[PDB]
Ligand binder design. Structure first.
Ligand SMILES: Cc1ccnc2c1ccc1c(C)ccnc12
Ligand SMILES: [Cu+2]
Length: 128
């Protein structure tokens, strides 16, 4: 029984988990992201973004084009189910979303949209 998860993004461009599980009982789910690194947001910034596996590449590509000022995320991206802000060393940010937005049978992935990061900083979020 739980409806939250704590996640860390470090100076080595890694999340401390590649798989998140969400209990179907949860009406809402919360992700608590933190950055235990010493590097600045402009060189090793991280955010936690959720979308379907099929929408990831698009969110990432458009995110990079949107730039640092937009936390590397296209404004009001309909493909984004949930998103934290872009954080740097010592920062934290939480995001809560409705579990109803997730439909079983569908593949969901979480990732960081800072340029190049999704290559390593990505994982699955499933609902069972
Ligand atoms: C890697 C991968 C890509 C796409 N779909 C899938 C997988 C792996 C497992 C899986 C299962 C168990 C059910 C439905 N789709 C997939
Ligand atoms: Cu990152």
């Amino acid at each position: 029984a739980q409806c939250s998860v704590d996640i860390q993004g470090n100076d080595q461009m890694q999340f401390n988990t590649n798989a998140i599980t969400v209990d179907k009982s949860c009406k809402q789910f919360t992700v608590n992201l933190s950055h235990p690194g010493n590097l600045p947001k402009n060189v090793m910034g991280h955010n936690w973004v959720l979308s379907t596996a099929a929408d990831m590449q698009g969110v990432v590509t458009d995110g990079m084009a949107s730039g640092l000022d937009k936390d590397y995320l296209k404004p009001d991206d309909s493909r984004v189910i949930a998103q934290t802000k872009l954080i740097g060393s010592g920062e934290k940010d939480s995001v809560t979303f409705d579990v109803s937005k997730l439909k079983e049978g569908e593949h969901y992935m979480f990732f960081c949209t800072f340029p190049g990061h999704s290559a390593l900083m990505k994982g699955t979020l499933t609902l069972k």
